[PDB]
């Protein structure tokens, strides 16, 4: 039982570590993008009517 549970936890850790490495840069640049994009889209939308 102990060996089997340890093997599964190790696999889970490996998977989480690989994801953290790639998600951290995207979350940090999110808020400036969303705000710049929304302002841009609203400005563009006012020229079509």
């Amino acid at each position: 039982r102990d060996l089997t549970l340890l093997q599964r936890e190790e696999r889970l850790r490996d998977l989480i570590e690989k994801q953290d490495e790639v998600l951290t840069p995207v979350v940090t640049s999110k808020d400036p993008f969303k705000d710049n994009y929304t302002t841009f889209a609203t400005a563009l939308d006012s020229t079509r009517h």
């Binding site: 039982r1 549970l5 599964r8 998977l15 994801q19 020229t47």
Partner: protein, 55 residues
């Protein structure tokens, strides 16, 4: 002995359920798709920067 085997199985299944959103291929696949759609859109916007600026 039989109780012990089934108890282990239960414990394993419980661990898998609790971590499925971040680990299972199904859920990870859905996140990929959403990200690819946005990429393509941004590529397009960057390609038409001049026209959009003029407008």
């Amino acid at each position: 002995a039989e109780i012990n085997q089934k108890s282990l199985e239960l414990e394993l299944l419980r661990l898998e359920k609790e971590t499925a959103d971040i680990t299972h291929p199904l859920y990870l696949g859905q996140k990929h798709q959403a990200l690819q759609a946005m990429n393509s859109h941004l590529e397009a916007v960057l390609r038409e920067k001049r026209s959009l600026r003029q407008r």
